[PDB]
Amino acid sequence: HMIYPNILATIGHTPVVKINRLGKDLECELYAKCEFFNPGGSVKDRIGYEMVVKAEKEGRIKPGDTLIEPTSGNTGIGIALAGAVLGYKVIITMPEKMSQEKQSVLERLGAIIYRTPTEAAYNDPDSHISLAKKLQAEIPNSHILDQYANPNNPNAHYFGTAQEIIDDFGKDLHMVVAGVGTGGTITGIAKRLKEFNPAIKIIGADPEGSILGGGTEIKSYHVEGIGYDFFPDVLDNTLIDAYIKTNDADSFRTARRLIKEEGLLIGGSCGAAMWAALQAAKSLSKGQKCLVILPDSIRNYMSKFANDEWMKEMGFL
Amino acid sequence: HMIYPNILATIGHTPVVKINRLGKDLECELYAKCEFFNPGGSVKDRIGYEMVVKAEKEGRIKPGDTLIEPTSGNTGIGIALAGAVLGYKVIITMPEKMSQEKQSVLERLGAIIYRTPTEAAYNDPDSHISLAKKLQAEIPNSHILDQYANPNNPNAHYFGTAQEIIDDFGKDLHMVVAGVGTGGTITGIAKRLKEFNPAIKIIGADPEGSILGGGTEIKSYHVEGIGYDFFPDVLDNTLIDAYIKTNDADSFRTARRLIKEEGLLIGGSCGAAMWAALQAAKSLSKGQKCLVILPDSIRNYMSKFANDEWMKEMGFL
Ligand SMILES: *Cc1c(COP(=O)(O)O)cnc(C)c1O
Ligand SMILES: N[C@@H](CCS)C(=O)O
DSSP states (O other): OOOOOSSSGGSSSOOEEEOTTTTTTOSSSSEEGGGGGGGTTTTTHHHHHHHHHHHTTTSOOOOTTTEEOOOOOHHHHHHHHHHHTTTTTEEEEEEEEEOOHHHHHHTTTTOOEEETEEEOOTTSSSSSHHHHHHHHHTTTEEEEOOOOTTTHHHIIIIIHHHHHHHHHTTTTOOOOEEOOOSHHHHHHHHHHHHHHHHTEEEEEEBBBBBTSSSOSSOOOOOOOOSOOOSSSSSSGGGGSSEEEEHHHHHHHHHHHHHHHHOOOOOOOOHHHHHHHHHHHHGGOOOHHHHHHEOOBBBGTTTTTTTSSHHHTTOOOO | OESSSSGGSSSSOOOOEHHHHHHHSSSSEEEEEEEESTSSSSSHHHHHHHHHHHHHHTOOTTTOOEEEEEEEEEHHHHHHHHHHHHHHHEEEEETSOOOOOHHHHHHHHTEEEEOOOOOOOOOTTTTTHHHHHHHHHTTEEEEEEOOTHHHHHHHHHIIIHHOOOOHHHHHOOOOOEEEOOOSHHHHHHHHHHHHHOTTOEEEEEEEESSSSTTOSSOOOOSSSSOSSOOTTTTTOOOGEEEEEEEEEEHHHHHHHHHHHHHOOOOHHHHHHHHHHHHHHGOOOTTTTTEEEEBBGGGGGGGGTTTHHHHHHHHOOO
């Protein structure tokens, strides 16, 4: 019976929904934590809020300053949302691979977007990571909050996301499956949940062509938000019990199944995480429960996996 | 805490957020009820659910049947969401004016879409309303729930939306502003809230070129979801204290202000309702409160008012 003082107060406390068709072949029950209910449309609202609010409280930033962030889109949106509400200028650097819908959301939130060449490595000089550094050196009173190293990324999940999981399931939860990009979600959740229940299994989903979950070959893929060519400082792989390597076709196919068979209007990496869970949860028995993190909404992919012509062009239909 | 058995259980109980910048010239305080948090992205999830569940309980429809609905998109999405979860085939008839994003969401939920000419009058043989009737006469086991006349449209707001408003505000609410399409939202809310507090003011927002809030001239406009060339049976204009006539330019400008200055990722008719509220709420004094219904998400308009190229093409930028 509470009124929210601003839109940032609606971040978090996201619904968990039972999966009723896709997990038909499992012994366990299967559930999804629906991060698309966040006001910016993704899990990254949590870390945009936490990084901005902690930095402001500590005196690292002040209203009127500029926040510069390299992003695949969602963290940019989370920071842009916090900046629109709290009074920060926001600049995003984003590879051309990321969807146009992300750029339009960013623009309407007041962020300025610099698009960079898709294929640049994390250290390549024209990359979004490098361009952000050049911008910070040239723009007075600017800051790169840096989701890849800022502890307020995993901390948002240790104190927030994982607390919600504890509140919803208690000890009656046996596995959590999460796609891994920065690693903040899986690391914050794994650390908190294993303190609470050391028997819980933590499963990462990592695309083929990423090194986070093993391997050395770097290769591009269409799924957005998961996988990297370097290990982010916030990722603690020692807390992860297993990785499942995912692929574009199965990710987008499973995402379409989530929409059509569960009515969940989700994104591409949601299909990746769910597909991984449909493999990994086979280790659970009757009466056990598996939770999958679903990071974002279909909105970011209307012109991509949600579009039949794009799917056929890219070999997924 | 709660685990939801399916996505339909997350419909409703939407946040009310204080408006902190746009209402700075008002004496009163200003608030927004954020219907874009519904799982289908709009207020119409409420009536898609209510119409399906009540018709099924009454024996008018049964799982496996086909539901055919004329819609501007959002009611179609709400019915498609219910149909995906509960097992109904869904066919939508929709004017060409409505966004491509709405059609893509409908298609991914498994619905079939028939597009009809924008300029057809509601009773022209080729309108979406007329086509739905022709399809129902031909397709076995098909039914039109009919949001324009079905009492479970306003009933969903009388028993649901309006109860939530009472729960959040009690007697400390003095005006509600809502755009009018079918009139189900404004009628169900007005009926319930005026029983609870007869002094509350109910303000409708109606586009220029619609007859709902007065006038006789029919003219096309780009804002989606509000205004019509006929009076829907569910609309009770005797419950509305005043209408404000809205226009595309002010609607899209105010929608862009809501996104940029409040971080509310809303749609075009949200700008219309908010622009109307910024006029009508001037009658309120310090210590009074005005609530604006915000019907849907920016997702439905990414290629339209949220896109600078579209705005330039249509003469708004
Ligand atoms: C339908 C709708 C409205 C108006 O709601 P009604 O209950 O039909 O009067 C306003 N905006 C949008 C986007 C809608 O879909
Ligand atoms: N994590 C993947 C690759 C192993 S290195 C797997 O379990 O097959």
